[PDB]
């Protein structure tokens, strides 16, 4: 047991899927996992462990922001022997060619946070995902007929930033998606010798705004979870 | 309605109590508020509005970390006309004379986060609470026979920091409590012209560790909520 | 005796009022103190000790700037047993509602300096005043029929700054006054375990632009001094 | 022609391999390219163009350091229509498991330099390689029976650094190799919309300490070059 | 007249000697200047203008610290036509081979202050003295048989620095003397278009701990002043 | 022999002229040195040692950028007994009154590089040249009838800087020339205990856009070399 996870070694699988909103953990468990059992309820962060095609897998939300996901990823890594962490969620896009519902795989993650500088002697730490995990995700997406975009994400500390101009800079340097965790999770993974990957679906633009329906989000979201889950299987093979 | 709060102007009172763990919102509403009604459920962040001695008051969790509470405090301030925000929770202490269960009022908040430097041209912004709110809290504590400690809090981005030595520095400069939101909330309050205060009860030491029981936490926690609630009334008078 | 103070333990009271201008120290000693004796003249930084309504009090200039006042307050605290320091000066206003002759009390002080970062491992140290001294001042002002404003001051290293943009930032984040020592004095107080407070009268506006020089301006300066002196009396009771 | 390159559009292929040492460029052109013509000699920074298995390819030294390679890659991209740059060099190891003759592929590059901060408004820019080029290299290596390691490289400004402590930090966070250009080249590629990749062979260890100079060392260097060349072929198909 | 100088264009000469101590200016005007006339008394920062060997010369203290001397040097330059500023003060030595009473000419000035970074977009501005003034001072010294070292000074913001290790770094890089103004005077001179030079007398050793010694003060101080005054005449010629 | 210099103690003179361009070193050795002998060819960084007016002198390129020249200057100083390093290069002007072919002596060197901050605990290290070498160069120039400005240079890390505004700041502060090595050479000289000086020829104007002009290159370049060589003789005397 740990400060934020009321469970014992063995309760979580070596691979954990982590959605932003906690509510999605229960949904992932009953929609994609078989024989799911509850393994955590502290602070309302429901955790579940089950199997996907015989493969043991766990799922539990990580809350919003670098400080929150840094806590859970760390405890999962050092207290429950977790080897791989896959964050699944959404992001905003700044590039005109990146459309709503596109799938983005964060090979790297920029940030305006100071956590990595605190870890790296105030130098530039390239917060990156595990390469094999990125390629597994891309191939799994391909197998499902999905066109996945791979590149840099930007993990913001402030959803409501004072410097609106930074989005122009992000666009100029090819940032594919804007979210709030990747750089933090990649930092933790690097600090404790584990693997991580962030997968996001474009939720909106930071220019204008396309209009759709939850019907065009349901299975697009399901597509993302499918990608994450199938990518783990390719990783094992 | 906003991205994270599914409610309309008027749903929240001008004063909002915000506990770390969401679960505590429901508890505060049924234990201290009368005629409470549910006003938000997005992402599981239950919000409630009711009255305390005829005084309209709302309560809703703010999640863990500066990035999370920065989102909610901002939306409450700019979209729901909230005037005062009081964070209630716990903290770790580094000073030998600060004991478990002591009540700490954050007049100021240090941090290792970069959000305030991003707002203040990379200069030092003194993240402070509203003075009247601090004095109301102190007096209310006094009226309940509580001995309140007032000073600096430290809002950490990383609960599991690599630099263990920083705690020695915190002790040397008199930091009363270590938590993860104050500096963020004070920053937002300053950015959008509102008032904020953080009140914490010492949850543990960062040296050794005292041992008690949940029985000595129940009403100590209730004491804190009482302080927060009575402080609002003194503020109105 | 210390490098910049040619006196001996006992020559100063445990409470020291400190204006920026040494000539202002003599003015204060001649106007409010009974039987005031000069206790220091090194570098012309006049220091005086006398009694206010029976209480032993000292007053001494601290020069212009954080580097200057940091030396004097530090020597007063570590070598003359001074336990409280109250800076009494003038500041420039940035907020339109802050008028001339308004009394400002800095419970917090933002800064341009790098001194607190050197002290706080390059993180954000919230330079705050001692809570009881702030409250004593508010009450003394109230007793005198004066509405004091409590909030953030901005301590600048450059009276003639090359970036006029900061003033808008200061205004946006609610800085009540701009001066040049508070953040330095509060840093020292925390480093050596003492208590400090900065009280200022607005002598110049930068929002509407305006100076001051009249009987009314000098009446407000004297009120500020009475607030400082009366606040020490309340601190004792 | 540009300031440092005396050639004309067309003299270079759209793909350029770049070793640090110009003499190494001539070596590469003489060893793997057919009908290689010298296309630049300004400052002795030898550039060559020829064909590898029918494909037009160029190779040219980039000098030592981010400042140096930043100039050449930038001119190649904005004035010679170069669309891909593959740095082929050597790096020092920090991790005990990273042995001599191991082929390292930098999907990411940490740095000491301030160049990306100047570009990214002082925030953390994750300098990453183009995903397809990384995958092409992994597959080409596989086809050659070589196990390549993919991860972070560290680009240093000081080959002789005054702080030997960084090496432990680099090891702790899993840096695979230490060199001096990757972060610079990846910054340029993102700024001007091109694609880049850095491939290195470990020529020195800092964990166990050791150099190299043998037939086996030179065999591994040539393997790295074949990996680079074969990877461009796969990129076309 | 300016905010800190009650004088009129013409009251000051085009060259001004500035010691930290206001009382030293008075001593200089009475000892080396003829027909000396006091031109400023604001804040007790005594200012004098007289003649030396027929040359019109002024002398005025600048107070302690970068923020103080910056104000005065700025006002002299923009409102009184001052072209040359020569600081004549005391400094602490960190090098073993540098002894007390030694005269150091600061051709450069290091600092832990943020004033120059604020002026120079957060980059490294090399705060240097005017070459001819340095050359003049070295020559005037030879003609007086006085020894003088030319190199870097370090202008600290904290006389009571909590960072003792920094003195070792200063020693390693050859800092000849530690004072508190040079970097500021040079920053101001470059910003407002004037020329400046700092000449210091080693008053003590930061290592051996021992301020000014015996009556050797006045004598060595007089050497510095003589060197400063003579160097002004070489300049005119 | 060192990692980048295949020579032996004794092959280099105690003073070394270093241009950026390796081919320029060759030109200098053939044009100004007698009995010139090549002592290094590693990476094509040609090095020569001959005699000038009987004085043993060496000349070797240092490559482009701070990271490159730092390596070479360091190796020369610690393994070949080099006491004096004189960089002879080209620079870009930002001041209108500074024209092409002008000779500038860098007594100081600003920079946007982080190398000196890494050496100087993140503070401001004023990168300066050895006073006597500067004085020698100014004198040798007068004796040659050549004009020469003495002041600050700016050593940039990015020749293709995305920050155009910075040139205005450089102009405001009197930067005489923009190059890419000075701050590094001076940092190294101070770290490894040697003396250095940078003499530059204004090759173009960053504003007017126009590199070296006509055959005026060789002539002005020869003036710089002559000045450098003669200054070495003044030094010996
Ligand atoms: C402006 C901005 N900054 C940071 N993250 C942002 C953002 N806009 C959107 N996001 C990310 O997308 C999620 C929403 C849109 O579902 C959010 O949960 C979030 O992960
Ligand atoms: C080492 C450290 N860093 C930051 N915050 C800390 C901390 N130790 C404790 N806290 C704070 O106290 C809360 C726990 C103990 O209930 C936590 O929710 C948290 O607010
Ligand atoms: C622009 C600016 N910056 C910093 N401090 C300032 C300022 N304008 C005024 N002050 C403060 O007010 C004092 C004078 C003007 O009475 C000054 O001594 C000073 O304390
Ligand atoms: C300590 C250290 N720092 C930075 N790069 C280093 C290094 N040690 C080795 N390298 C890299 O390996 C190349 C040489 C040694 O073959 C060098 O050219 C270089 O790319
Ligand atoms: C350790 C240390 N740090 C900074 N300045 C120091 C010093 N030791 C001596 N000095 C200098 O002498 C002046 C003192 C007397 O205020 C200062 O203005 C300065 O010129
Ligand atoms: C705009 C700009 N920035 C930096 N260096 C510049 C420059 N314009 C010219 N120079 C200088 O000349 C060298 C070129 C030829 O590589 C560089 O080494 C340098 O000495």
Chain A residue whose CA is closest to D155? A124
- Which position has the token pair 């009881």? C132
- Contact indicator for F177, F104 with CB cutoff of 8 Å: yes
- Regarding the beta carbon of F92 and ligand 6, being less than 6 Å apart is answered yes
Q: How many CB atoms lie within 10 A of CB B50?
A: 20
Put simply, whether F21 touches D (Cβ < 8 Å) is yes
- Assigned token pair, C179: 């001066």
Quote the Cα angle for A106-A56-A219, to 5°. 50
- Which of C159, C200, C202, C224 most suits a substitution to test ligand 3, by most atoms within 8 Å of the C-beta? C159
Q: What values do phi and psi take at B78, rounded to 5?
A: -90, -20
Report CB contact under 8 Å: D67, F68.
yes
Q: What are all long-range contacts of B212-219, with beta carbons under 8 Å and residues at least 24 apart?
A: B212/B100, B212/B101, B216/B101, B217/B101
CA F156 → CA B199, D78, E121, F180, distances in Å? 49, 20, 13, 5
Residue whose C-alpha is closest to residue C196's, from C29, C104, C77, C110: C77
CA atoms of A131 and D153, how far apart (whole Å): 14
- Assigned token pair, A75: 């405890």
C190-204 exposure pattern, b = at least 16 Cβ within 10 A, e = fewer: bbeebbbbbbbbbbb
- Return the H-helix or E-strand segment holding E31: helix E22-32
Q: Are strands A84-93 and A34-40 parallel, antiparallel or unpaired?
A: unpaired
- Return the H-helix or E-strand segment holding D49: strand D47-52
Residue whose C-alpha is closest to residue D160's, from E222, F78, B152, F204: F78
- Assigned token pair, F152: 């600050």
Counting ligands in written order, the one closest to the CA of B100 is 2
- Regarding the beta carbon of F156 and ligand 6, being less than 6 Å apart is answered yes
Q: Which of the 8 DSSP states describes residue C210?
A: B
Q: What is the CATH number of domain C1-237?
A: 3.40.50.1580
Residue B89 Cα, gap to closest chain A Cα (Å): 13
- Return the H-helix or E-strand segment holding E141: helix E131-142
- Contact indicator for E62, E173 with CB cutoff of 8 Å: no
- Regarding the beta carbon of C179 and ligand 3, being less than 6 Å apart is answered yes
Query: What is the CB-side half-sphere exposure of residue C31 using CA atoms within 13 A?
Result: 15
Report CB contact under 8 Å: D158, F67.
yes
Put simply, whether A190 touches B (Cβ < 8 Å) is no
- Which position has the token pair 């012309």? C44
Q: Give the one of A22, A67, A159 whose C-beta lies nearest to B44's C-beta.
A: A22
Put simply, whether A180 touches B (Cβ < 8 Å) is yes
Counting ligands in written order, the one closest to the CA of C43 is 5
- Assigned token pair, C232: 């020490």
CA atoms of C59 and C73, how far apart (whole Å): 12
CA E131 → CA C42, C103, E134, distances in Å? 34, 48, 5
Q: Which residues pair with E153 in a beta bridge?
A: E109, E177
- What is the distance in A from the centroid of ligand 4 to the CA of D159? 7
Chain D residues within 8 A of F20 when measuring between CB atoms: 43
- Contact indicator for E58, E9 with CB cutoff of 8 Å: no
- Contact indicator for A134, D131 with CB cutoff of 8 Å: yes
Candidates E67, E178, E181: best to mutate against C (most CBs of C within 10 A) is E67
Q: 3-class SS at F22?
A: helix
- What is the distance in A from the centroid of ligand 6 to the CA of F71? 19
CA atoms of E70 and E65, how far apart (whole Å): 9
Q: What are all long-range contacts of A163-167, with beta carbons under 8 Å and residues at least 24 apart?
A: A163/B118, A163/D121, A165/D121, A166/A112, A166/D121, A166/D123, A167/A94, A167/A206
- Regarding the beta carbon of E20 and ligand 5, being less than 6 Å apart is answered yes
Range list of H helices, chain A: 23-32, 66-79, 115-119, 131-143, 166-172, 182-191, 215-236
Distant-in-sequence, close-in-space partners of D220: CB < 8 Å, separation ≥ 6? D101, D103, D201
Beta strands in chain C (DSSP E): 15-18, 34-40, 47-52, 55-60, 84-93, 103-111, 148-155, 177-179, 195-205
Of C14, C204, C223, C236, which one is the catalytic site residue? C204
Of all protein residues, the one whose alpha carbon is nearest to atom 2 of ligand 3 is C159
Residue E52 Cα, gap to closest chain C Cα (Å): 25
Of all protein residues, the one whose alpha carbon is nearest to atom 2 of ligand 5 is E159
Task: Find out whether E204 is annotated in a ligand binding site.
Answer: yes
Q: Is F153 exposed, middle or buried (0-12, 13-18, 19+ CB in 10 A)?
A: buried
Q: How many CB atoms lie within 10 A of CB C209?
A: 9
Q: Is F214 exposed, middle or buried (0-12, 13-18, 19+ CB in 10 A)?
A: exposed
- Which position has the token pair 């502060």? F173
Quote the Cα angle for F109-F114-F116, to 5°. 55
Structure method = X-ray
CA atoms of D185 and D198, how far apart (whole Å): 9
Of all protein residues, the one whose alpha carbon is nearest to atom 12 of ligand 1 is A91
Q: Give the one of C43, C44, C115 whose C-beta lies nearest to E157's C-beta.
A: C115
- Return the H-helix or E-strand segment holding D88: strand D84-93
- Contact indicator for E200, E153 with CB cutoff of 8 Å: yes
CA atoms of D237 and C157, how far apart (whole Å): 62
CA atoms of E39 and A90, how far apart (whole Å): 69
Put simply, whether E135 touches F (Cβ < 8 Å) is yes
- Assigned token pair, C15: 């409470």
Residue whose C-alpha is closest to residue C92's, from C184, C227, C200, C169: C200
- Regarding the beta carbon of C139 and ligand 3, being less than 6 Å apart is answered no
- Compute CA B33 distance to the chain's CA centroid, rounded to the nearest angstrom: 18
Q: Give the one of B123, B138, B193 whose C-beta lies nearest to C110's C-beta.
A: B123
Provide DSSP, A123-140.
SB---B--HHHHHHHHHH
Q: What values do phi and psi take at F123, rounded to 5?
A: -100, -175
Residue C65 Cα, gap to closest chain E Cα (Å): 5
- Which position has the token pair 């004033």? E115
Task: Find out whether A88 is annotated in a ligand binding site.
Answer: yes
The secondary structure of F129-151, three-state, reads CCHHHHHHHHHHHHCCCCCCEEE
- Return the H-helix or E-strand segment holding E56: strand E55-60
- Which of F203, F204, F207 most suits a substitution to test ligand 6, by most atoms within 8 Å of the C-beta? F203
Active site includes D163? Answer: no
Counting ligands in written order, the one closest to the CA of E177 is 5
- What is the distance in A from the centroid of ligand 3 to the CA of C203? 8
Distant-in-sequence, close-in-space partners of C97: CB < 8 Å, separation ≥ 6? none
CA atoms of F2 and D159, how far apart (whole Å): 13
**Count of residues in chain C:** 237
- Contact indicator for E182, E127 with CB cutoff of 8 Å: yes
Report CB contact under 8 Å: F125, E124.
yes
- Contact indicator for E59, E29 with CB cutoff of 8 Å: yes
Neighbours of chain E (3+ CB pairs under 8 A): C, F
Q: Do chains A and E touch (3 or more CB pairs under 8 A)?
A: no
Candidates B111, B160, B185: best to mutate against A (most CBs of A within 10 A) is B160
Breaks (C-N over 2.5 A) in chain A follow: none
Q: Is B125 exposed, middle or buried (0-12, 13-18, 19+ CB in 10 A)?
A: buried
- Regarding the beta carbon of D61 and ligand 4, being less than 6 Å apart is answered no
Of all protein residues, the one whose alpha carbon is nearest to atom 16 of ligand 3 is C90
- Stated in angstroms to one decimal place, the resolution of this structure is 2.4
C88-112 exposure pattern, b = at least 16 Cβ within 10 A, e = fewer: bbbbbbbbeebebbbbbbbbbbbbb
CA atoms of F172 and F164, how far apart (whole Å): 14
- Which position has the token pair 């519902």? A101
Distant-in-sequence, close-in-space partners of E185: CB < 8 Å, separation ≥ 6? E69, E70, E73, E85, E87, E109, E196, E198
Q: Do chains B and F touch (3 or more CB pairs under 8 A)?
A: no
- Contact indicator for D194, D80 with CB cutoff of 8 Å: no
- Assigned token pair, B180: 């993860």
Put simply, whether E191 touches F (Cβ < 8 Å) is yes
CA atoms of D10 and D49, how far apart (whole Å): 10
Residue whose C-alpha is closest to residue A45's, from A56, A33, A58, A32: A58
- Regarding the beta carbon of D68 and ligand 4, being less than 6 Å apart is answered no
- Which of A103, A157, A159 most suits a substitution to test ligand 1, by most atoms within 8 Å of the C-beta? A159
User: How large is the greatest C-alpha to C-alpha distance in chain C, in angstroms?
Assistant: 48
- Assigned token pair, A43: 């602070």
Put simply, whether E210 touches F (Cβ < 8 Å) is no
Task: Find out whether F8 is annotated in a ligand binding site.
Answer: no
- Return the H-helix or E-strand segment holding A103: strand A103-111
Distant-in-sequence, close-in-space partners of C216: CB < 8 Å, separation ≥ 6? C101
CA atoms of D204 and D213, how far apart (whole Å): 10
Q: Are strands A148-155 and B15-19 parallel, antiparallel or unpaired?
A: unpaired
A12-35 exposure pattern, b = at least 16 Cβ within 10 A, e = fewer: bbbbbbbbbbbebbbebbeebbee
Counting ligands in written order, the one closest to the CA of F198 is 6
- Contact indicator for D127, D111 with CB cutoff of 8 Å: yes
Q: Give the one of D64, D67, D162 whose C-beta lies nearest to F157's C-beta.
A: D67
Beta strands in B55-137 (DSSP E): 55-60, 84-93, 103-111
Neighbours of chain D (3+ CB pairs under 8 A): A, F
Neighbours of chain A (3+ CB pairs under 8 A): B, D
CA atoms of C79 and C77, how far apart (whole Å): 6
Q: Are strands D195-205 and D177-179 parallel, antiparallel or unpaired?
A: unpaired
CA atoms of D137 and D150, how far apart (whole Å): 10
Counting ligands in written order, the one closest to the CA of E24 is 5
- Contact indicator for E40, E46 with CB cutoff of 8 Å: yes
Range list of H helices, chain F: 22-32, 66-79, 115-119, 131-142, 166-172, 182-192, 216-236
Q: What are all long-range contacts of A222-225, with beta carbons under 8 Å and residues at least 24 apart?
A: A222/A31, A223/A103, A223/A144, A223/A146, A224/A88, A224/A103, A224/A199, A224/A200, A225/A17, A225/A28, A225/A31, A225/A32, A225/A88
Range list of H helices, C33-163: 66-79, 115-119, 131-143
Chain D residues within 8 A of A109 when measuring between CB atoms: 126
CA atoms of D56 and D77, how far apart (whole Å): 16
CA atoms of D6 and D28, how far apart (whole Å): 20
CA atoms of E207 and E194, how far apart (whole Å): 35
Task: Find out whether C138 is annotated in a ligand binding site.
Answer: no
- What is the distance in A from the centroid of ligand 4 to the CA of D206? 10
Q: What values do phi and psi take at C219, rounded to 5?
A: -75, -40
Q: What are all long-range contacts of D205-212, with beta carbons under 8 Å and residues at least 24 apart?
A: D205/D92, D205/D93, D205/D98, D205/D99, D205/D100, D206/D92, D206/D93, D206/D94, D206/D167, D206/D178, D207/D93, D207/D94, D207/D95, D207/D96, D207/D98, D207/D171, D208/D96, D210/D100, D212/D100, D212/D101
Residue F92 Cα, gap to closest chain E Cα (Å): 18
Query: What is the CB-side half-sphere exposure of residue D48 using CA atoms within 13 A?
Result: 25
Chain B residues within 8 A of C135 when measuring between CB atoms: 135
CA B60 → CA A67, B51, B76, distances in Å? 19, 14, 10
Quote the Cα angle for F32-F35-F40, to 5°. 90
CA atoms of B30 and B42, how far apart (whole Å): 20
């Amino acid at each position: 047991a740990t400060p934020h996870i009321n469970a014992e070694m063995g309760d979580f699988a070596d691979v954990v899927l982590m959605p932003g909103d906690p509510l999605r953990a229960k949904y992932i468990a009953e929609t994609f996992l078989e024989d799911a059992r509850e393994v955590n309820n502290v602070r309302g962060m429901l955790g579940f462990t089950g199997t996907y095609k015989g493969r043991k897998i766990s799922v539990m939300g990580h809350g919003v922001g670098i400080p929150s996901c840094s806590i859970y990823t760390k405890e999962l890594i050092t207290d429950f022997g977790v080897k791989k962490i896959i964050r699944v969620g959404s992001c905003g896009a700044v590039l005109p060619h990146v459309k709503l519902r596109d799938v983005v795989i964060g090979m790297g993650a920029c940030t305006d946070s100071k956590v990595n500088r605190i870890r790296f002697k105030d130098h530039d730490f390239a917060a990156i995902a595990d390469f094999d995990m990125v390629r597994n995700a891309v191939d799994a997406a391909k197998a499902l007929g999905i066109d996945a975009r791979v590149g840099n994400l930007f993990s913001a500390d402030l959803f409501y930033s004072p410097d609106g101009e930074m989005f122009d800079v992000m666009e100029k340097y090819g940032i594919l998606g804007v979210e709030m965790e990747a750089a933090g999770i990649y930092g933790v993974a690097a600090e404790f010798g584990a693997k991580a990957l962030t997968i996001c679906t474009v939720s909106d633009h930071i220019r204008t705004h396309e209009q759709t329906t939850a019907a065009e989000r349901q299975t697009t979201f399901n597509d993302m979870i499918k990608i994450a889950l199938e990518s783990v299987l390719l990783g094992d093979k």
